[PDB]
Ligand binder design. Structure first.
Ligand SMILES: [Mg+2]
Ligand SMILES: [Mg+2]
Ligand SMILES: [Mg+2]
Ligand SMILES: [Mg+2]
Ligand SMILES: [Mg+2]
Ligand SMILES: [Mg+2]
Ligand SMILES: [Mg+2]
Ligand SMILES: [Mg+2]
Ligand SMILES: [Mg+2]
Ligand SMILES: [Mg+2]
Ligand SMILES: [Mg+2]
Ligand SMILES: [Mg+2]
Ligand SMILES: [Mg+2]
Ligand SMILES: [Mg+2]
Ligand SMILES: [Mg+2]
Ligand SMILES: [Mg+2]
Ligand SMILES: [Mg+2]
Ligand SMILES: [Mg+2]
Ligand SMILES: [Mg+2]
Ligand SMILES: [Mg+2]
Ligand SMILES: [Mg+2]
Ligand SMILES: [Mg+2]
Ligand SMILES: [Mg+2]
Lengths: 260, 59, 134
RNA sequence: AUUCAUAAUAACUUUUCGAAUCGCAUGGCCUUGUGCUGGCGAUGGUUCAUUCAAAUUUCUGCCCUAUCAACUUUCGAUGGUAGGAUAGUGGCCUACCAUGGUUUCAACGGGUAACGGGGAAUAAGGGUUCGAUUCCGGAGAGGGAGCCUGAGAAACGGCUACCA
RNA sequence: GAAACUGCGAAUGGCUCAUUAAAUCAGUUAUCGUUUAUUUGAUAGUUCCUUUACUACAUGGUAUAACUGUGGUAAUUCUAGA
C-alpha cells in the first residue's frame, strides 16, 4: 500500500515485549537493523520497560543522547534501534553489562553478565558465499559480514565474534550432540544438546532435541542455535537454564517458597 | 502604455509613459529581442536603441 | 500535622539520569493528605540534596483516608534537575517561568498566513503601497 | 536441483562509480621549506550482505440462484516459436502457427440492502444468525483516464484532460 | 539568526466500505522469477597520455534564489524586465 510502513499499533506489536493493552495506542516500531522486526527488543523497551531506568519515552532519548547506552560495543543512539538475540548492551555509568538471551517463556530476559564476557558474542552463520574477487565471506544471524572465515565453517555453525575488532575466534560445528538454544516457535527459550536431524530435501529440516531433564522436543532447523557442548555453554545461561517446568511444577516452586 | 526601460551598463531604471498611437505604433508586430531605433518613439530618445525584453498586458 | 511519616519504597540508584528515583508512601493519620511542597522539603531534608533538586508527583491518596502514594525523584544537583526535569514540573516548583504564548490555533493560522508570502515581506509592503496611487 | 556463487579470454560503452565536501581539535618530526607528516567523526560513495519492504506466486476453502446449460477466440479464448515490453516470470503485448481451454464433481450467466479475516450473538450436543465498525489484509478519495516527482504513488490535503 | 538555496519528508498516519463472488481474504507455499530509499556489516593504491622539454591538486567553470531596484492585474501561495 504505496510504500514502507512507519507505525506500529500496540496490539500488533510482538507479545514477548509485554506491553500493556491500554496507556497509549502505538508501540515503538523497531528501526531497520541487524535483527528482524518481530524478533527484536528496541532500546526504548529495554531502557524503560525492563530496566525501569526511564519513565518517559522522552526520558529515553535523554539517556541515549548522552551515549550512556552502547550495543555490541558501539555507542548507538536510536530510541527504537532493534536490539536482538545474542547482542550485548552496555552501560558504562552504572558499570553494567547485559546480554540479550531468551527466557523459557520466550521472552527477552534482563540478564547481567561480566565485563569479561562482554568482550565477545555468538553468531549463527546464516550463509557462506564467495564474494567478489574470490574472497569468501560468512554472514551471521545478526547480519555481520566477516571476510576470510575458516573453510570448515559451514551453514548453521555458531561462531565466536570478537566485537572489539570484527574478527572470528572460534566455531562450533553442527554435529549430533551439541548444546543448542532454541530461537523461535513454541519451544523458544528451551535448551538441549541435539539428538538427531531429519533431513527432508527441499522443505524444512527437523531437529530433535533433548535437554538435561531427559525431555524431548522438535523444531525446524531454522529455529536451532548451537552454543557449545553438553554441560558447557559458550555464554552464561539465564537462571532456569531453559528446562521448562510444567504448570504444576511451576505452581509448586512458587508455593514452596512461601514463608516470609 | 508604460515603457519600462533599463540601462544595464549603469544599473539604472525608470519608467516612461506614452499616449501617442503613432509613437506607440512603432513597437507593434516587433518581437522580444528585436531592436528598435529611437526618434520615432520620442525626440528624447533620438539615437537610443531599445531591445524589447517582455512586459505585461492588462489583466 | 499528626506524626505524618514519609516512607520511600522500591528505591533505585539511577546514574544515567543523575538522580535517585523512588516511590513515596505517605501515611498520614488524622491529616487530610499531605502536600507536594511539604514532601519536597522533607525528602530534601533526608536525602541531603536540598528542596529545589527534589521532584515529586504521581500521587493519589488511598480510599477511605489514611494513606497517599506517590513517586519521588532527587537529583544530584540543581543543575541536573533543571535539565532532566519536564518543564511543566519546574513550573509547579518555581524554578522556571511559564513562558506563555498565543493560542494553538492562533499560532497555526500565523504559520498559514506566512505560507502565502515568498521571501521577506517588506518587499511586498512597498509594492502594495503603490496600489494606493492606482 | 542450475548455464549458481566466483573467476578467466576477445572486445564493447554519447562510459557508471573511483571524495575538488564539512566540524572539533592543533601535535609531532629536520636538511627551518610556513616543508613533510598527523587525532577524533560528519556527510558522501560503487558493489555485496542485512534490515524495513514490495511485486508476483503454489495448494485448499466463499452467500442465494437452472424461471441461468453450455460457456470461451468482437478486437487472445487455450498452447508452441521468436521478439518486444517489464524490476522481473507470463498472451502482458505483437508477429507466425496450431485448435485448444471450462463444464451436472454445476461451468458460463444473474442476484447480493457482499469488502475479506481475527471475530460477535444464541448456551445439552449437533447447529443457526451476524461481522460498515478499536487488530491484520484489500480498495477508494465526486466519477473516469492520464502522468510528473521519487527508493517507493498510477498519489488526489500532487499535477493534466474530459464529465458531473 | 529572518529570508532563500540544498538535503530529507509529504507513498506513514487518519477516514470510509462504493466497487469486488475465484476476486479479495485466510491458512499453507514459491523467487533456480524480481525491485528495493533507509538501518546494520562489509567493500575501491589502477582515473592523464606516442609515456624528456607536460596535464590547475596549494583544489578548475558560471548561472541563480533570497536581496536591491523598476513594473503589470479587480482578483490567488500570479509573476515580468533589469
Ligand atoms: Mg522508528
Ligand atoms: Mg526451500
Ligand atoms: Mg504550532
Ligand atoms: Mg518559511
Ligand atoms: Mg553468471
Ligand atoms: Mg603544527
Ligand atoms: Mg429471474
Ligand atoms: Mg438440461
Ligand atoms: Mg508464447
Ligand atoms: Mg494479423
Ligand atoms: Mg477454435
Ligand atoms: Mg446446483
Ligand atoms: Mg456493497
Ligand atoms: Mg469487517
Ligand atoms: Mg459477510
Ligand atoms: Mg454499507
Ligand atoms: Mg490509493
Ligand atoms: Mg463526498
Ligand atoms: Mg468511466
Ligand atoms: Mg488519483
Ligand atoms: Mg492523503
Ligand atoms: Mg493508510
Ligand atoms: Mg549557464
Amino acid at each position: 500500500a504505496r510504500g514502507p510502513k512507519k507505525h506500529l499499533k500496540r496490539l500488533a506489536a510482538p507479545h514477548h515485549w509485554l506491553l500493556d493493552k491500554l496507556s497509549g495506542c502505538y508501540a515503538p516500531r523497531p528501526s531497520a537493523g541487524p535483527h528482524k522486526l518481530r524478533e527484536s527488543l528496541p532500546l526504548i523497551v529495554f531502557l524503560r520497560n525492563r530496566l525501569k531506568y526511564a519513565l518517559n519515552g522522552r526520558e529515553v532519548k535523554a539517556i541515549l543522547m548522552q551515549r550512556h547506552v552502547k550495543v555490541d560495543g558501539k555507542v548507538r543512539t536510536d530510541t527504537t534501534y532493534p536490539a536482538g538475540f545474542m547482542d550485548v548492551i552496555t552501560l558504562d555509568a552504572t558499570n553494567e553489562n547485559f546480554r540479550l538471551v531468551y527466557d523459557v517463556k520466550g521472552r527477552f530476559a534482563v540478564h547481567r553478565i561480566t565485563d569479561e564476557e562482554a568482550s565477545y558474542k555468538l553468531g549463527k552463520v546464516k550463509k557462506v558465499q564467495l564474494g567478489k574477487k574470490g574472497v569468501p565471506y560468512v554472514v551471521t544471524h545478526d547480519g555481520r559480514t566477516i571476510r576470510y572465515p575458516d573453510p570448515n565453517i559451514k551453514v548453521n555453525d555458531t561462531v565466536k565474534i570478537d566485537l572489539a575488532s570484527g574478527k572470528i575466534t572460534d566455531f562450533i560445528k553442527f554435529d549430533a550432540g551439541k548444546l543448542v538454544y532454541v530461537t523461535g516457535g513454541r519451544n523458544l527459550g528451551r535448551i538441549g544438546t541435539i539428538v538427531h536431524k531429519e533431513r527432508h530435501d527441499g522443505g524444512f529440516d527437523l531437529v530433535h532435541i533433548k535437554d538435561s531433564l531427559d525431555n524431548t522436543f522438535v523444531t525446524r532447523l531454522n529455529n536451532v542455535f548451537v552454543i557449545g557442548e553438553q554441560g558447557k555453554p559458550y555464554i552464561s545461561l539465564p537462571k532456569g537454564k531453559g528446562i521448562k517446568l510444567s504448570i504444576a511444577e511451576e505452581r509448586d516452586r512458587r508455593r514452596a517458597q512461601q514463608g516470609l | 502604455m508604460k515603457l519600462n526601460i533599463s540601462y544595464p551598463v549603469n544599473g539604472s531604471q525608470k519608467t516612461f509613459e506614452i499616449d501617442d498611437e503613432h509613437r506607440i505604433r512603432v513597437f507593434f508586430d516587433k518581437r522580444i529581442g528585436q531592436e528598435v531605433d529611437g526618434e520615432a518613439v520620442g525626440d528624447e530618445f533620438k539615437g537610443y536603441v531599445f531591445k524589447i525584453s517582455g512586459g505585461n498586458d492588462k489583466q | 500535622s499528626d506524626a505524618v511519616t514519609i516512607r520511600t519504597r522500591k528505591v533505585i540508584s539511577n546514574p544515567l539520569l543523575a538522580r535517585k528515583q523512588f516511590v513515596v508512601d505517605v501515611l498520614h493519620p488524622n491529616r487530610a493528605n499531605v502536600s507536594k511542597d511539604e514532601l519536597r522539603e522533607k525528602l530534601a531534608e533526608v536525602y541531603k540534596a536540598e528542596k529545589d533538586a527534589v521532584s515529586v508527583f504521581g500521587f493519589r491518596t488511598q480510599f477511605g483516608g489514611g494513606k497517599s502514594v506517590g513517586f519521588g525523584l532527587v537529583y544530584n544537583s540543581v543543575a541536573e534537575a533543571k535539565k532532566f526535569e519536564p518543564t511543566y514540573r519546574l513550573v509547579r516548583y518555581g524554578l522556571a517561568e511559564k513562558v506563555e504564548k498565543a493560542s494553538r490555533q492562533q499560532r497555526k493560522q500565523k504559520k498559514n498566513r506566512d505560507k502565502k508570502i515568498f521571501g521577506t515581506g517588506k518587499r511586498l509592503a512597498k509594492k502594495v503601497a503603490r496600489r494606493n496611487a492606482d
